[PDB]
Write a protein that binds this ligand. Structure first.
Ligand SMILES: [Ca+2]
Ligand SMILES: [Cl-]
Lengths: 179, 179, 179
């Protein structure tokens, strides 16, 4: 024996040196891991803040877009109602109102004034109005001597004429062209 | 010799105690690292879910905003067309339609009715219409004895008057104030 | 003694074997940690890219939504102005314009034409216009013999009638129904 002990101590020393080197490298690696995962934890923590902020802006946006969608839908329906109901300056097909109409100063057709303000200062004619048979080519016989029937005919036609003047006046008054 | 072996065993023991303490601390650190990085992995996994969900809401929003942008542009163009084409209640400059106009009941100027419904019940006058020279200050000589020429003058002026009544009636009919 | 050295070497061997096994397991764990935290670092790095991209799309959206909000508000105010100012085809309450009106071809009431283009070709009557007292039931005495006063009465009433024709013509001209 004797020799075996020296051999054993040397080989134990060899293993000790191997353990020492491997522990050193483990220590290096773990010290390296400590810093890096700590950095990751801080990076993850910071990311949650940003994601939370973004979530706070997305649900806000989703609400505003929904509100705007409602406003535009309302607007589109107001436009559609107007489009069907408004009186156009350019439309060529005759347009009709369900109401009376009042305008300032004049009504015109094709750019020339045809209707204005009511003409006042009229005293309404009285008597009979003639809207019946009326012949403007009615003539009258006039002899060289006085004939009652011929003067009666003239007077009769004067009456029918005055009664037709009143009838026309009545029509103007009823419309409102004169007072 | 002899002594060297005891010295060697003691110093080997010293190193063994040092290795034992350092292995213990490594074990502590690595066990600590195991839990923490596992927590980070779970936190990263959870973050991907939230980010994916948010990405799912952002591309959706970008589509809706684009669709609303198109709707509003369409609406703004419908408004612009109306603004230029509509008849205003407050505008003071004369406004013109490219079409005929129909209204209920009346036309008014300055708040007083000047035009209404067509007046009916008329029998159209026949004969000549006089829209020519007409003097309302025309007078007539009347002697104390019968004079044919003086009665002819009266009859002649009655005819021109009846023919002017028809002319005026013709104008009213053509417009449509009377039937 | 003697025996103690063998006992010491064996127990040192026992500890060496224990250290060797624990170092092996530490090495396994740390090699496992190396890969996993590296994966986490890459995953965190990739997440920052996506979050940055999303942040780049959210502030963009917040700007567009704000711009659209301004456009719709502007549109809603243009609609409100129109709603109050436009002339309705269906409204039944009388509507009034602050301006004159011009139309193509005709004005109608209740679907029948009552007003058209100005009637031309007229020669304006001259003299006095009579808008005063006028009795259409005025009659005339006609004797069987010539009576100056009776012919004067007829002539007088013819003058008042011709002067009333001019007055009516004057009213039509002033409105614009005739030239
Ligand atoms: Ca030993
Ligand atoms: Cl990690």
């Amino acid at each position: 024996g004797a020799y075996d002990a020296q051999v054993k101590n040397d080989e134990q020393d060899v293993e000790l040196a191997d353990h020492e080197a491997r522990i050193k490298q483990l220590r290096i690696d773990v010290d390296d891991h400590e810093s890096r995962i700590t950095a990751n934890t801080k990076a993850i923590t910071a990311l949650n803040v940003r994601v939370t902020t973004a979530e706070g802006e997305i649900a806000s946006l989703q609400t505003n877009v929904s509100a705007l969608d409602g406003r535009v839908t309302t607007a589109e329906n107001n436009i559609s109602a107007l489009q069907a109901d408004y009186v156009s300056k350019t439309a060529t097909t005759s347009q009709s109102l369900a109401s009376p109409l009042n305008v300032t100063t004049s009504y015109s057709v094709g750019g020339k004034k045809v209707l204005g303000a009511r003409q006042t200062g009229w005293t309404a004619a009285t008597g009979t109005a003639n809207k019946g048979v009326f012949d403007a080519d009615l003539t009258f016989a006039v002899s060289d001597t006085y004939t009652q029937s011929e003067i009666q005919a003239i007077a009769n036609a004067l009456i029918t004429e005055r009664r037709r003047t009143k009838a026309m006046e009545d029509a103007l008054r009823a419309h409102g062209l004169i007072d």
